Design a protein around this ligand. Structure first.
Ligand SMILES: OC[C@H]1O[C@H](O[C@@H]2[C@H](O)[C@@H](O)O[C@H](CO)[C@H]2O)[C@H](O)[C@@H](O)[C@@H]1O
Length: 924
C-alpha cells in the first residue's frame, strides 16, 4: 500500500506554499528582490544583471545573476542563478561529493534549437526604475523589467499578458549553513517512506508566480488524471486542494480527477481565450509543483468595487536547479506549440507499423501462445501490426535473455510474424539483476555505469528481479554501452522486426520512497537524483532509441520505443502511454483529455491501455474502448496479470463484429493518420486536436475535452464513453456544414450549436467538416505492411463554398531517406469544380532522383473519389475529365441527389491516376 507525499509532507512544497500564504496575507508585501540597476547591460538580444536578494533584517544581500534573452522566434527566456554557488563557495554536508552548482544541464537534454538571439531586439525606454525591451515580429512584443521590487510584464497589442512576480512570490533559497540560533524543521534531513534524505545542500528550491492576465483557462503540464482545462488547487467546489505535482512516479491504481503526479512530466502551460494565446515552459528537471487560482485582479479576488476581468494566478516551484523559463506570446495555440517544438523538438518520424493496432498483455506465456494469437486474429479478420512481450519472456527477469523453457524458438516466432509484415515488441527495463553468471551486470559494475548512493557506492534495490542495480543513462558511456547490447548477433532471438518497450524508468524502485530512488542518489556529473529525477525516464528512452538506429552493419532505420516515464523532449524518441489505468467507464472517459493534453504539450504520440489495464472490462466497455482507442495516436490493448484473457476475438458476438469494424476503420484511415504524424514531425502540430486549438475564436470551445479533430482531415470525433449511452451530443464549433462519416447525413449547417446524434453500441460518432479533403485505403488487409501498395480513395467534403483542401504524405515507413526527399507529399485542392493534386512543398519533378521506393510507388493510384455535398449542377453528368502526365481521359461519375437529411454526393470510380503525379480532375 502506497504512500505519496502531500504538499505538507514535501519540505520545499510546504515552504513555498507558506511563502505564498504569508505574501498574500501580508499588508503591502514587497518581494525582497531588486535589480542593481548599474549592474545591468543590454547587448545583442540579451539583458544581464545582478538581482540582490535581501535575506534578513540587517539588509544583508546575496547576488543572483539574471539573464533575459530575446530570441529570433519572438520567444523570451528568463534565467536566475545563484552567484555563490556558481563559484563553489559553499560547503556540502556529510562530505558529499554532490555538485555545488545549481543544476544547469536540463538545457543540454531538452533544447535542440530555436536559441538564436534577436539582434533586432532593442531598448525602448530605460530610466533607472525600469527598462522596456521591444522584440519579436516587427517589434510587436515588449517586456518591461522593473528593478525594485523585481518584476517583468510581457505585453503585446498594448496589454500585459504574462507577469512575473506581480504577487511577489519569487523565491530562490540561497545556500545557508546548518546553525542553531544565537521554521527550519524541513531544511535538513527529511524522512519519508522508510527513507531518510540526507539533504547535503540544504534548502535550494526555486519558485515564481506567473499571472496570465485576463485568461480564465490554462492547459498543459501533463501527465495528470485531470481535465484538459486545469483546475484550481487552493480549494473551492470542484477544485483541488493540493498543487499539481510533477514527480515521475510509479503510481499503482492511480485515481481519477487528481493533481497527484503520474509517470511523466512536461512543465509547459498555455493560456487561451478568444483570439488570444500565451504560454510558458518551466525548464526544470526537479520535483515541481504548480498551484493555480483564478479571480479578479484585486488582492482579495472576490472584492467588490473592482473590474470583473479574471486573471489566472499560477505558482511554480521546483526543488533545485536554475529558475529557467521561456515565455511564448502566440497569438494562436498553433503558434505557441510550434515555438515550443522548435525549442524542444518535433515528433520523430515513426515506424509506419507503429500506427497500427498493438496487441499486448502481461503475459503471452510461450512462443506457441504468441503464434496461436497471431493465427486467431487472422481467423476472426481482426487486423493488427504488433504482438507484445511483457517481462515473463525473460530468464528470471534478466534483460537481454529469454526463458528457454517457454520461449524455445524466438527467431521462428519472429519469422511467422514477418510473413504478414508484423512485428514483435519486447520489454527492457532499466534495472539489471544483481546475480552471478550474468555478463550484463558484470559489465555495468566494472564499467561504472550504475546509479550510485549518496556516498558513491553503487545503488542497490528491489524490482522485478529482486535485488538489482540501475543503469545511469545520464552517462554517455552507459548509453554507448547499451547500444552494443541490442545488435542482433548480441541480443539473441531478436531480428529486424523486433522493437522495444521501456517501462519502470521513473525509475520504479519497489522498496524506495514513493517507489523511486532516494533523492540523494548520485548520477554521472555528481548531480543528485533530486536535480534530475524528471529527466531520468527520458535518458533511458534515449539510450534505447539510439540502440535501435543500427543493430547490424549497413542498417540505419527508425527506432520504435514505447516509454512510461518522460519529460519535455521525449517526442523525439517515441511513444508514451498513460500507464496502469483501470477497466472502468470513468477511466475510458478520462483517457481522452489525458491524450489530448499530451499532444498540446508537444508529445502527441500517446494513448491509454485499451480495455484498461487493471481488472475485467464488461463486454460493452471493451467494445466502446476499441471505438475510442482507434483515435489514440498510440493504439494498444494491454491487460494486467490477474485479468482474464481478452484478445478481442474472445469477446463474443455482437461485440466481435463491432470491434472488428473499429479496427477496420483505423486501418482504412492509416494514410491520414500517417500524414497527421508527418505534420507533427514538420512543426509539432498535434495529431488529434482539441477545440481550443482548431477554433481559437470560439470561446465556448475552451473547456471542451471530449471531442477532437483528426490531423488535417476535418474529421471530428466524439466517442461514447458512458455506460448504456445510446446517443451523443456533439458540440458543433462553427457555421460550416458537418456530415456523418458513415451515412452523410447533414448534422449541422449554418450555426454553432449542440447537435444530438444516434449512438448505439455499433456506432462510432464521427463527422466530416466541410472544406476538407482526406485520403483513406478501402481495401481491408491483415496488417499495415500488406496495405503498402494498395490504391487510395479521396474524400472531398464540400460546404457552401464548394472549396476544400487536404494532403497526403507517404514514404517507405522505415528509413531516413525522407531526409533526402524520398517521399510523396500531395496537396489536394478543390475549387471551381476542379480537384487538383500538386507537390505539397512545390518541388520540381526530377530535381529529386527516384529511389527504389519511389519507383515502386509508380504502380500506386488514386482509384476513387467521393465528393460529399456535391452541387446540383452535376446532376445528369456522367463523366469527369481527368488530366495527368500529359494524358486526358473521361471517367464515370455517379451523382446521388440529396435525400431526407442525407447529403447529395458523387462517386468517381476507376480514376486510374498515379498518386505521385500532378493531376487535374474537372467535374460538371
Ligand atoms: O511489466 C509488467 C507491468 O509493469 C508495470 O506495471 C506494474 C503493475 O501495474 C503492478 O504490478 O504494480 C507495479 C508497481 O506499481 C507496476 O509497475 C507496467 O506499467 C505494465 O504496463 C506492465 O505490464
Amino acid at each position: 500500500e502506497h504512500d505519496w507525499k502531500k504538499c505538507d509532507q514535501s519540505g520545499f512544497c510546504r515552504r513555498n506554499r507558506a511563502y505564498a500564504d504569508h505574501a498574500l496575507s501580508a499588508i503591502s508585501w514587497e518581494s525582497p528582490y531588486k535589480i542593481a540597476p548599474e549592474t545591468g547591460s543590454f547587448k545583442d538580444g540579451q539583458y544581464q544583471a545582478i538581482i540582490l536578494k535581501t535575506i534578513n533584517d540587517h539588509g544583508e544581500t546575496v547576488r543572483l545573476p539574471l539573464t533575459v534573452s530575446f530570441l529570433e522566434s519572438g520567444t523570451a527566456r528568463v534565467t536566475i542563478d545563484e552567484e555563490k554557488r556558481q563559484k563553489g563557495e559553499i560547503e556540502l554536508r556529510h562530505d558529499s561529493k554532490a555538485r555545488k552548482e545549481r543544476y544547469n544541464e536540463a538545457e543540454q537534454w531538452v533544447i535542440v534549437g530555436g536559441m538564436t538571439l534577436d539582434k533586432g531586439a532593442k531598448v525602448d525606454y530605460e530610466d533607472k526604475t525600469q527598462m522596456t525591451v521591444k522584440y519579436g515580429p516587427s517589434s510587436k512584443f515588449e517586456a518591461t523589467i522593473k528593478f525594485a521590487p523585481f518584476s517583468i510584464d510581457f505585453k503585446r497589442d498594448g496589454a500585459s499578458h504574462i507577469k512575473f512576480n506581480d504577487q511577489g512570490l519569487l523565491n530562490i533559497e540561497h545556500w545557508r549553513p546548518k546553525i542553531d540560533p544565537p521554521d527550519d524543521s524541513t531544511w535538513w534531513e527529511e524522512s519519508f517512506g522508510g527513507n531518510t534524505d540526507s539533504k547535503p545542500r540544504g534548502p535550494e528550491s526555486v519558485g515564481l508566480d506567473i499571472s496570465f492576465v485576463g485568461y480564465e483557462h490554462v492547459f498543459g503540464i501533463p501527465s495528470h488524471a485531470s481535465p484538459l482545462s486545469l483546475k484550481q488547487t487552493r480549494g473551492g467546489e470542484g477544485n483541488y486542494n493540493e498543487p499539481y505535482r510533477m514527480y515521475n512516479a510509479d503510481v499503482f491504481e492511480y485515481i481519477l480527477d487528481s493533481p497527484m503526479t503520474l509517470y511523466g512530466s512536461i512543465p509547459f502551460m498555455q493560456a487561451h481565450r478568444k483570439d488570444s494565446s500565451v504560454g510558458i515552459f518551466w525548464l526544470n528537471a526537479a520535483e515541481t509543483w504548480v498551484d493555480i487560482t483564478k479571480g479578479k485582479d484585486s488582492k482579495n479576488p472576490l472584492a467588490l468595487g473592482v473590474k470583473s476581468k479574471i486573471t489566472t494566478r499560477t505558482h511554480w516551484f521546483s526543488e533545485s536547479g536554475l529558475l529557467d523559463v521561456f515565455v511564448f506570446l502566440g497569438p494562436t495555440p498553433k503558434d505557441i506549440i510550434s515555438k515550443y517544438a522548435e525549442l524542444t523538438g518535433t515528433t520523430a518520424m515513426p515506424q509506419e507499423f507503429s500506427l497500427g493496432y498493438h496487441q499486448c498483455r502481461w503475459n503471452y506465456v510461450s512462443d506457441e501462445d504468441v503464434k496461436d494469437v497471431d493465427r486467431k486474429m487472422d481467423k476472426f479478420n481482426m487486423p493488427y501490426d504488433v504482438i507484445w512481450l511483457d517481462i515473463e519472456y525473460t530468464d528470471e527477469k534478466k534483460y537481454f535473455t529469454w526463458d528457454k523453457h517457454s520461449f524455445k524458438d524466438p527467431i521462428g516466432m519472429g519469422k511467422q510474424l514477418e510473413a504478414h509484415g508484423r512485428k514483435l515488441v519486447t520489454i527492457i527495463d532499466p534495472h539489471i539483476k544483481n546475480t552471478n553468471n550474468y555478463p550484463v551486470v558484470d559489465e555495468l559494475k566494472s564499467k561504472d555505469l550504475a546509479v550510485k548512493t549518496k556516498d558513491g557506492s553503487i545503488f542497490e534495490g528491489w524490482c522485478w528481479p529482486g535485488s538489482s542495480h540501475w543503469i545511469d543513462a545520464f552517462n554517455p558511456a552507459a548509453r554507448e554501452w547499451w547500444k552494443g547490447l541490442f545488435k542482433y548477433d548480441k541480443f539473441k532471438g531478436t531480428m529486424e522486426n523486433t522493437f522495444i518497450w521501456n517501462a519502470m524508468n521513473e525509475p520504479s524502485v519497489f522498496n524506495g520512497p514513493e517507489v523511486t530512488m532516494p533523492k540523494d542518489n548520485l548520477h554521472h556529473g555528481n548531480w543528485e537524483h533530486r536535480d534530475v529525477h524528471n529527466l531520468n525516464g527520458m535518458t533511458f528512452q534515449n539510450a534505447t532509441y539510439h540502440a535501435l538506429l543500427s543493430r547490424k552493419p549497413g542498417e540505419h532505420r527508425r527506432p520504435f520505443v514505447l516509454t512510461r516515464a518522460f519529460f519535455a523532449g521525449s517526442q523525439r524518441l517515441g511513444a508514451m502511454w498513460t500507464g496502469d489505468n483501470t477497466a472502468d467507464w470513468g477511466y475510458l472517459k478520462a483517457s481522452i483529455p489525458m491524450v489530448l493534453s499530451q499532444g498540446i504539450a508537444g508529445f502527441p504520440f500517446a494513448g491509454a491501455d485499451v480495455g484498461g489495464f487493471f481488472g475485467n472490462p464488461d463486454k460493452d466497455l471493451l467494445t466502446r474502448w476499441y471505438q475510442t482507442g482507434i483515435f489514440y495516436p498510440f493504439f494498444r490493448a494491454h491487460a494486467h496479470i490477474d485479468a482474464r484473457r481478452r484478445e478481442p476475438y474472445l469477446t463474443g458476438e455482437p461485440y466481435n463484429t463491432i470491434i472488428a469494424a473499429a479496427l477496420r476503420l483505423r486501418y482504412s484511415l492509416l494514410p491520414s493518420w500517417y500524414t497527421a504524424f508527418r505534420h507533427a514531425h514538420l512543426d509539432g502540430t498535434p495529431i488529434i486536436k482539441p477545440m481550443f486549438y482548431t477554433h481559437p475564436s470560439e470561446e465556448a470551445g475552451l473547456p471542451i475535452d471530449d471531442q477532437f479533430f483528426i490531423g488535417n482531415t476535418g474529421l471530428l470525433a466524439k466517442p461514447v464513453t458512458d455506460k448504456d449511452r445510446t446517443s451523443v451530443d456533439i458540440w458543433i464549433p462553427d457555421s460550416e456544414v458537418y456530415y456523418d462519416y458513415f451515412t452523410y447525413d447533414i448534422i449541422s449547417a449554418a450555426k454553432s450549436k449542440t447537435a444530438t446524434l444516434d449512438a448505439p453500441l455499433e456506432k462510432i460518432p464521427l463527422l466530416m467538416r466541410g472544406g476538407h479533403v482526406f485520403a483513406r485505403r478501402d481495401i481491408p488487409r491483415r496488417s499495415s505492411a500488406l496495405m503498402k501498395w494498395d490504391p487510395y480513395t479521396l474524400v472531398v467534403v464540400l460546404g457552401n463554398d464548394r472549396k476544400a483542401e487536404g494532403d497526403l504524405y507517404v514514404d517507405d515507413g522505415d528509413s531516413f531517406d525522407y531526409e533526402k526527399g524520398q517521399y510523396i507529399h500531395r496537396r489536394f485542392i478543390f475549387d471551381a469544380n476542379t480537384l487538383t493534386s500538386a507537390d505539397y512543398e512545390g518541388r520540381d519533378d526530377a530535381s529529386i532522383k527516384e529511389g527504389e521506393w519511389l519507383k515502386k510507388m509508380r504502380t500506386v493510384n488514386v482509384e476513387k473519389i467521393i465528393v460529399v455535398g456535391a452541387p446540383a449542377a452535376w446532376k445528369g453528368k456522367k463523366t469527369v475529365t481527368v488530366e495527368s502526365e500529359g494524358k486526358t481521359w473521361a471517367a464515370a461519375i455517379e451523382y446521388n441527389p440529396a435525400e431526407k437529411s442525407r447529403a447529395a454526393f458523387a462517386v468517381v470510380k476507376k480514376v486510374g491516376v498515379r498518386v505521385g503525379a500532378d493531376f487535374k480532375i474537372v467535374f460538371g
